[PDB]
Design a protein around this nucleic acid. Structure first.
Ligand SMILES: [K+]
Ligand SMILES: [K+]
Ligand SMILES: [K+]
Ligand SMILES: [K+]
Ligand SMILES: [K+]
Ligand SMILES: [Mg+2]
Ligand SMILES: [Mg+2]
Ligand SMILES: [Mg+2]
Ligand SMILES: [Mg+2]
Ligand SMILES: [Mg+2]
Ligand SMILES: [Mg+2]
Ligand SMILES: [Mg+2]
Ligand SMILES: [Mg+2]
Ligand SMILES: [Mg+2]
Ligand SMILES: [Mg+2]
Ligand SMILES: [Mg+2]
Ligand SMILES: [Mg+2]
Ligand SMILES: [Mg+2]
Ligand SMILES: [Mg+2]
Ligand SMILES: [Mg+2]
Ligand SMILES: [Mg+2]
Ligand SMILES: [Mg+2]
Ligand SMILES: [Mg+2]
Ligand SMILES: [Mg+2]
Ligand SMILES: [Mg+2]
Ligand SMILES: [Mg+2]
Ligand SMILES: [Mg+2]
Ligand SMILES: [Mg+2]
Ligand SMILES: [Mg+2]
Ligand SMILES: [Mg+2]
Ligand SMILES: [Mg+2]
Ligand SMILES: [Mg+2]
Ligand SMILES: [Mg+2]
Ligand SMILES: [Mg+2]
Ligand SMILES: [Mg+2]
Ligand SMILES: [Mg+2]
Ligand SMILES: [Mg+2]
Ligand SMILES: [Mg+2]
Ligand SMILES: [Mg+2]
Ligand SMILES: [Mg+2]
Ligand SMILES: [Mg+2]
Ligand SMILES: [Mg+2]
Ligand SMILES: [Mg+2]
Ligand SMILES: [Mg+2]
Ligand SMILES: [Mg+2]
Ligand SMILES: [Mg+2]
Ligand SMILES: [Mg+2]
Ligand SMILES: [Mg+2]
Lengths: 93, 50, 97, 51
RNA sequence: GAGCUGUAAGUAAGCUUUGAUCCAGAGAUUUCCGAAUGGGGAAACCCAGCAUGAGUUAUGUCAUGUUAUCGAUAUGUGAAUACAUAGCAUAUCAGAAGGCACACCCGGAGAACUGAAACAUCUUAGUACCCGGAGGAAGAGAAAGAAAAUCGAUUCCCUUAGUAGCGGCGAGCGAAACGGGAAGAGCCCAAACCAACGUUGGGGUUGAGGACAGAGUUACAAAGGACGACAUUAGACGAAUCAUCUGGAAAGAUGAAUCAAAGAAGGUAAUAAUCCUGUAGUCGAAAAUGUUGUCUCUCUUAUCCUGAGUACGACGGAGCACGUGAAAUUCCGUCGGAAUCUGGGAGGACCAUCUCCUAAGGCUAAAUACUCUCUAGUGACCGAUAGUGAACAGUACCGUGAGGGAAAGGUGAAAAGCACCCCGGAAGGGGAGUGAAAUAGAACCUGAAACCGUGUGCUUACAAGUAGUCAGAGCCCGUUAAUGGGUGAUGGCGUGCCUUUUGUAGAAUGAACCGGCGAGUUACGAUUUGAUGCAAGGUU
RNA sequence: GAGGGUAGCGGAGAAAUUCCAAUCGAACCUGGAGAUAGCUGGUUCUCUCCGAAAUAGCUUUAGGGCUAGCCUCAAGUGAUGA
RNA sequence: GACAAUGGUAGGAGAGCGUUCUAAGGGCGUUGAAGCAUGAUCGUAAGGACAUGUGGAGCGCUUAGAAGUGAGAAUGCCGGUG
RNA sequence: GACUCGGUGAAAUCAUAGUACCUGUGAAGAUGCAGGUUACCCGCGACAGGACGGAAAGACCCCGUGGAGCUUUACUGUAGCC
């Protein structure tokens, strides 16, 4: 339900209430990487490099295209192909 | 050969066998003579001696 | 075991035998016969039904303990002399069946 | 009185609520409950069988 | 339906919405050893013969196929020896071999320690082990039965009953029938006699019958089809929560809501029915395996005989709960050896009568037994010395070999796994950083005790000791605030603990210390007591 | 020296109960198997009330056992106890 | 309230403490559970609290139920260290 | 070799030990008890009288209705032979 490029809101963690684009996904870890969320400050030996660390996918939520409210995801079968629909409003993503 | 017991007067038991009374006899098996071992009871109760 | 002294059940002798054709009867006394009302015909089936006799065994024998105080027609396999006399003397009757 | 499937399905998800039939009554269930809600027919059957 | 090139990082090169990685069904490939099978061999190697085909002038070399043994089938050559047979060649087939959870089953063969308070009969026990044969079950099975008013194949469960009985009548061994249940099913030949060439078809299948005069591939005969439906082997959809507080993080607290045929369960930065995976519910199959149906399909509509080297008997054994016994009943070896419906067998020696049955041919599902497995689940079962030997292993290690056989889990929510500076060759440190926390820095959660050190408040170099205890100044502290804490000059008393013993300080036993682990349990019977229910009844 | 053979109810022995994989009056491994052990050792929290025996008889019995004697718990009886 | 009894091995009888799990009820916990450490606390005993420090996520209490339920000794077993 | 120094560094043993002697006492031979006598605290090199010193659950002896090997005119069997 969460896909790269989607606009999501963080619903748990230090960045709760923040919003950002989904940089990457990791299905084996059930984790995602979101822009500007969960900065890590790693020690690099060629300085201190700031980069986002993954967060659990269940800690972010898709946003409703109509009411902007965070919404869960359902599915429909428009024109055969399975499509995503917001549970809040009922509109496609 | 069958198996059973030899029993003494004191009824001690030792294993023993009972063997058939086999006699080597010239017999016609499959239409060709051959010397086979056949019991005397079988010979009386007619293989076929040749 | 008595530590090597001859056990009691070896020093005492065996006695008797068991009869293979032994007959044992379910026994009913007159005080048990009191339960039924006057004029009733008593049978082994009736006794088992009313629950006086649980197991029939080789038959049903009426015995003379207790007092009858009722008039009955008692049909059973055996009666003691006192039981028969009391049944007949209370106004009733008995029959060996 | 008997196995009422719609009552059972309606009630089986509420915490603390348990549904049984007249023949299914047992001491653990009854003692654990604080209240018994019984239909008239179920009560009549319970009286009939427990005498 | 977007990532992917195992575990598994790490780069390198790539693949993938023109649908990859992945999942399921079906196919293709599938080196060598191994029954191993062309021959050999010290397994995973060596050496070949034939036929076909690359190659080479040619040889060497190479590729494919085939070549074991015992078996079947049918063509030859064919001894001593006349004919034949044995034997030897060929051609075709592919029947056997070996393995296992071989656990359960059937059969062959078969101990001992042990108990009997010794021991030989007996018991352990037809048990362990070994050998052979199979199946999803096997075995048994359609009365020469049980019985004594009659029942009606076999098997298994309850009970009968620790009864009847067996027994150096010792220790012990120990039924069955009746009754109640699970399940349920019945059949085919041989022979009398017919028609065809003794062998074939018809005839027939029993307690008196026979001769004569709609059923089925689960036995009862064996091959297919057509179609349907269901199941398994991937999957899909699937309701409902927001806010503040503390916190690194909220699922916790508080407030206010919502769903529920869904409040099973995991996960998510602490404890979530409404965040995720899911759950209730519902849907789904190209293909392959199964189950089951309708149609089809075929198959079908007392003259004579009735199992002979048998039954049976003697001897020697064995199996029967039953040890030779008054021992019926069943089986094996040796030797003898019947009768033929006016027959034969059984009813516990045997005779007679009566009653029941009809051996010496075969087949037969189900109720029953087991779990290396698979699928779905469960637990007043374990939680790293436990639980499998094995949470990371039949490994390491030991042994010539059979064989024996360990130890070893935990950073953190997230690697954010410590840039950089300084001492040091390094190791290791001190800072600085990351992190909620680094005495969470990988030998990483917690971090006990033994044991080893550093500092010091009181004390100790004239003193004889199971080390404490009671009395007690001095000095130093100040509590769960209690007629307090630490230490202790000096005086009185005082030979550890356990075990085993008449009696142990004992110079009798045992313990280096610390930690973990380590011993009257459960099942079925008996008896007794307490409790409770009912009571001449009680209870299944 | 190399290659071989004999195997435990057995081999081998110029003979010692000698050797058969570092202990042979009967090898080693696994199993029956938790053999049996009338023997020795061990057997884990507390307090309360009572509290022995080391004797007789019989015993292939004598450091074992059984019955009695002596202990304890509970019901009864009731003068029977000292 | 007034009288009496209360040494004890084998052993009999009774009443209790504590451990793990379960059921039901009622609670505690990141404003810090269990565990560990210290203390001058409480009960007739087995043992029960409280406070502080450490620790970082579970755990008490009541009643009842069930046991792999209590170790100092076995030339005990394993580990650690003298 | 021992001994001193630099390096490396075990073991059997071990209830805790601040571990004297005499005469006595005592499970009848005492570092640990009694009464006396003697002795300032801590090492190092040496000796072996004691710690009934360490080592191996005495081989001797007895006991177990324990085992095993062996013998025979012990008992009962049995391969084999007639
Ligand atoms: K068998
Ligand atoms: K014995
Ligand atoms: K015929
Ligand atoms: K015989
Ligand atoms: K006694
Ligand atoms: Mg080969
Ligand atoms: Mg070969
Ligand atoms: Mg097999
Ligand atoms: Mg014996
Ligand atoms: Mg959902
Ligand atoms: Mg007979
Ligand atoms: Mg017949
Ligand atoms: Mg642990
Ligand atoms: Mg383990
Ligand atoms: Mg710490
Ligand atoms: Mg640690
Ligand atoms: Mg001084
Ligand atoms: Mg002086
Ligand atoms: Mg003193
Ligand atoms: Mg003595
Ligand atoms: Mg001493
Ligand atoms: Mg001793
Ligand atoms: Mg010792
Ligand atoms: Mg210890
Ligand atoms: Mg016992
Ligand atoms: Mg020797
Ligand atoms: Mg000699
Ligand atoms: Mg020699
Ligand atoms: Mg040797
Ligand atoms: Mg055994
Ligand atoms: Mg043993
Ligand atoms: Mg007393
Ligand atoms: Mg006193
Ligand atoms: Mg006392
Ligand atoms: Mg007791
Ligand atoms: Mg108690
Ligand atoms: Mg308790
Ligand atoms: Mg225990
Ligand atoms: Mg110990
Ligand atoms: Mg020198
Ligand atoms: Mg030195
Ligand atoms: Mg003394
Ligand atoms: Mg003396
Ligand atoms: Mg002395
Ligand atoms: Mg002294
Ligand atoms: Mg010295
Ligand atoms: Mg010594
Ligand atoms: Mg000894």
């Amino acid at each position: 339900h969460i896909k790269k490029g989607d606009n999501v809101k963080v619903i748990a963690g230090k960045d709760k209430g923040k919003e950002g684009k989904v940089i990457a996904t990791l299905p084996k870890k059930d984790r995602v990487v979101v822009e500007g969320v969960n900065i890590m400050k790693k020690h690099q030996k060629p300085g201190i490099l700031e980069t986002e660390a993954a967060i659990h996918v269940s800690n972010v939520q898709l946003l409703d295209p109509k009411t902007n409210e965070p919404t869960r995801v359902g599915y429909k079968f428009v024109d055969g192909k399975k499509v995503r629909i917001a549970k809040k409003s009922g509109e496609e993503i | 050969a069958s198996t059973g017991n030899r029993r003494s007067h004191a009824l001690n038991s030792t294993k023993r066998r009972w063997n058939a009374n086999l006699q080597k006899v010239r017999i016609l098996v499959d239409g060709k003579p051959k010397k086979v071992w056949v019991s005397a009871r079988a010979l009386k109760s007619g293989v076929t001696r040749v | 075991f008595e530590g090597g002294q001859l056990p009691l059940f070896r020093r005492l002798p065996k006695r008797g035998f068991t009869n293979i054709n032994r007959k044992e009867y379910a026994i009913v006394n007159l005080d048990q016969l009191n339960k039924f009302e006057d004029g009733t015909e008593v049978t082994p089936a009736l006794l088992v039904e009313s629950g006086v006799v649980k197991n029939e065994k080789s038959g049903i024998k009426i015995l003379g303990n207790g007092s009858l105080d009722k008039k009955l027609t008692v049909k059973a396999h055996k009666f003691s002399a006192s039981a028969a006399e009391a049944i007949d003397a209370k106004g009733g009757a008995h029959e060996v069946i | 009185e008997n196995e009422d499937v719609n009552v059972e399905l309606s009630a089986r998800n509420i915490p603390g609520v348990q549904v049984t039939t007249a023949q299914g009554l047992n001491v653990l269930d009854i003692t654990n409950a604080d209240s018994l809600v019984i239909t008239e027919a179920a009560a009549k059957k319970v009286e009939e069988v427990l005498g």
